[PDB]
Design a binder for this molecule. Sequence first.
Ligand SMILES: Nc1ncnc2c1ncn2[C@@H]1O[C@H](COP(=O)(O)OP(=O)(O)O)[C@@H](O)[C@H]1O
Ligand SMILES: Nc1ncnc2c1ncn2[C@@H]1O[C@H](COP(=O)(O)OP(=O)(O)O)[C@@H](O)[C@H]1O
Ligand SMILES: Nc1ncnc2c1ncn2[C@@H]1O[C@H](COP(=O)(O)OP(=O)(O)O)[C@@H](O)[C@H]1O
Lengths: 723, 249
Amino acid sequence: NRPNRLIVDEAINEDNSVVSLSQPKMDELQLFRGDTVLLKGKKRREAVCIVLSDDTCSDEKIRMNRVVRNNLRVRLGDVISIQPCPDVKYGKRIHVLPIDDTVEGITGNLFEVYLKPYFLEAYRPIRKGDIFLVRGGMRAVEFKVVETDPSPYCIVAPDTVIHCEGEPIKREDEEESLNEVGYDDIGGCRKQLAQIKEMVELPLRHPALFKAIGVKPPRGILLYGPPGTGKTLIARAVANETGAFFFLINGPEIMSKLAGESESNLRKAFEEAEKNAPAIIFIDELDAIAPKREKTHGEVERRIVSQLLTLMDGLKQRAHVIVMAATNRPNSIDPALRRFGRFDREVDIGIPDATGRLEILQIHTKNMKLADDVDLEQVANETHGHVGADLAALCSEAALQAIRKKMDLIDLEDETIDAEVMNSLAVTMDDFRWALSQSNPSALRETVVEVPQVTWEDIGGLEDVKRELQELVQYPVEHPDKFLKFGMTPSKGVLFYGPPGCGKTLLAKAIANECQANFISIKGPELLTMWFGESEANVREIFDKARQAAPCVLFFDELDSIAKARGGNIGDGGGAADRVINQILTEMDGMSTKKNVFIIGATNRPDIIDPAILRPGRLDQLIYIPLPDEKSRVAILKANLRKSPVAKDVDLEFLAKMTNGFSGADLTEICQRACKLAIRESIESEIVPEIRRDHFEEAMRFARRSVSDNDIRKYEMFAQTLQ
Amino acid sequence: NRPNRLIVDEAINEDNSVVSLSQPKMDELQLFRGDTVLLKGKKRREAVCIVLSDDTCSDEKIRMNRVVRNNLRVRLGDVISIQPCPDVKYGKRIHVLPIDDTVEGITGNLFEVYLKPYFLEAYRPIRKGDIFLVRGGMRAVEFKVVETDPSPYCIVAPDTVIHCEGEPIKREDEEESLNEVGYDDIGGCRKQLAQIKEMVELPLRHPALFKAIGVKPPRGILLYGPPGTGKTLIARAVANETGAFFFLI
Ligand SMILES: Nc1ncnc2c1ncn2[C@@H]1O[C@H](COP(=O)(O)OP(=O)(O)O)[C@@H](O)[C@H]1O
Ligand SMILES: Nc1ncnc2c1ncn2[C@@H]1O[C@H](COP(=O)(O)OP(=O)(O)O)[C@@H](O)[C@H]1O
Ligand SMILES: Nc1ncnc2c1ncn2[C@@H]1O[C@H](COP(=O)(O)OP(=O)(O)O)[C@@H](O)[C@H]1O
């Protein structure tokens, strides 16, 4: 269909002016990784960029960063024309020059720093007019090239004399400035980022179609998550990047006004925004306006929760407006806000995980120029519990520490503090570890939901259980119509039972990982909390959170916990049923047909579990998890030692021999007991620094087995008795 | 880097006009515990103080109390110039004289008490203009030395005839009065005192930098503790000592 045009799409690399083509296009465009290519754009303008070769991209989507797009005036999903330019011709000092307000308090010589490092080792091709952006010294300043000695475009060479100027030509009115947040400023919430963009792509990008079609596009979207997880960030990025007019209501501003000065700004906020359409109204802190409940007193509060309901109703789909509202927990707001036609979509931004806390950290230091040893992987490992704002606060406190150890050491403080001096400034690992030492996990801790990092590589033995579990959890999600051929419902429960420390937890996490599914762990103390606190209404919030995190594995560990707290060898006079397990029964059997929520219980006392859990439509598959065998006891010892260094001198299958049986936990005990005797040696020294066989022999002096061969027979009994 | 300048920092002793140097500096400045030293300060003014020798201080930080700093116009973290003055020359009755409102209901003869005990056993060196402060009888009254018979500075000796006056010259508008609380008025909360000063040092002391840098300085701080533990005290001291405008809701 005249394959010249191509779509624009996001790109992974940090560098500017690099487009990443789909590899089965090589000889079509005929141009390799050494050829720069001209790209057509809106208001009659272009750019030229060197090309990279990668597998994962789609065929039709060019991958390029924000700066190369803004000048093109392409917004993601737009199409550009890609035509080669082998005809490239080098320049002699293209003239480059500072812009915006960015251009903040800088002074002196910014060219040996904000240019010369960047142009070097590069040959970065530059067409006159590009905004190409540089970063250093806790700031991103971009230099627009106003003049190119040859034209239109030029490679840069190390041999072009370089022109010191530094004058502040103000940015033109019509371009929308770069400082503003795009999608690449959002680190760690991306699964849901596709979700919001999917909802809003067609309404915001294509106003014509919904006037040319019968259908209803989403009227309002409810972003919810703990505070500081980037909900405002998301709304702004989506608005800024689609180009739609972003209006911002925040609850306390509306609540700041007097009665009738309030709802006027509110009903003006939409009657102002529906002009500028397509537009996004972001109502964050929707709890401030709209907790319509028992708890509000007064008419004027109840008035404002009203009229918000009827501005939601008032948009007739001739409004191109999308309404986003940020909330913290969903029960927070008035339930009539969720009527269909007000806030129909509900999207949970959630706490970022270790794998996500990395990207956030890497977004909030892109201007710093760090120090070489800090790896941001273990920085991202000990920041657990931090939302993305906690993370932004960490690295800014890191950078204010390092500015405390240096600089004003001399007291160089002048009118405008020097450029080259902050670029020298670097922040080492001893700053960040000092940044964490502060209170910063002052944000929320509630039930986590993320893909665990335990692959099957971590579980010694249990081969048959590993394949049994895959069938239970995998085959239904992958191959449904096969289940439909025999008219079968996949069983959605499992109950692991066996002695303690045999890996019932590991297996559950391992299988969530193999599915790349979310894993919610409800541990024993949390069920006991509901049972003492007589609050089993919490079990509903647990399953609805699995439903929103689906596909997920929901794991009840120590499901016998409440049965124990009642005794159970003699125990109370009652039956097996109790408050909390009752609500687990209720919420299980009353759950949605298949949302890919798979329920795993685990127990070390299958004896005293109530049998109602067992009935079909519940945890329906009992899987015994035995004490390991020396076959497995070898892989248990290795999967523990696959991190810490273990010299060849100490040998395994002989340790794994001497134990008639231990738990996989008793073996980790031995391992960790040995590794303690080692570090004891290494800290002391020197006044050698690795593990040794005699470390493990002193460890084995304390090796105890927690399972007494009595109850294995008891466990052996529950096995054949049940079938 | 032209090691003349040095930073100002807090000091443990109760007495006035004593700066406590870092001991591995002895022969650099070449001056021992028997030499008085001239220190440069803002709006073209100085002071001279005898020196003490201690281990725990940093190398770059002079340790001196509030009174010796206020006239210097140095606020902690500022830098002053330290140059020796073995050339010291004694005075004959520097003229000293009461100031502020402090100067409250006092009367009769305050010189046998608010001066003569303090000058004694001392040789306290005094440059014309110093505010050096004395305490007695449930009040702290400070006497500014308006006139020095030789100049600029003088040791005091027990042999200088002493001038009874006691007149209330009102304090000049531009100096920020001593009665106001500093860090040394806060006794027992100090671990967190370093914490608040760490948070607020760079934003309050260096307004230029956060305009010259991308970053966000702390917007608000929440002091909490049982009532009467000095939370207002802390906020005022930090404000008064960095010099920033303190508003109180
Ligand atoms: N996922 C994220 N990626 C990058 N930055 C984030 C993320 N989440 C939060 N932040 C940072 O946290 C700060 C607070 O974000 P904001 O959206 O105001 O919080 P909330 O989510 O409560 O609305 C923002 O300045 C943003 O830079
Ligand atoms: N079969 C095993 N293979 C590897 N490690 C194990 C095994 N069993 C136990 N462990 C180690 O012991 C710890 C406790 O095991 P856990 O998963 O709690 O089992 P359970 O739930 O049966 O008590 C885990 O951290 C795990 O690393
Ligand atoms: N750590 C302290 N050191 C010295 N004085 C203190 C201290 N804490 C309290 N005070 C005294 O207690 C009085 C009450 O202090 P104030 O700051 O008003 O109380 P709060 O801490 O409730 O704000 C102040 O006059 C102050 O002199």
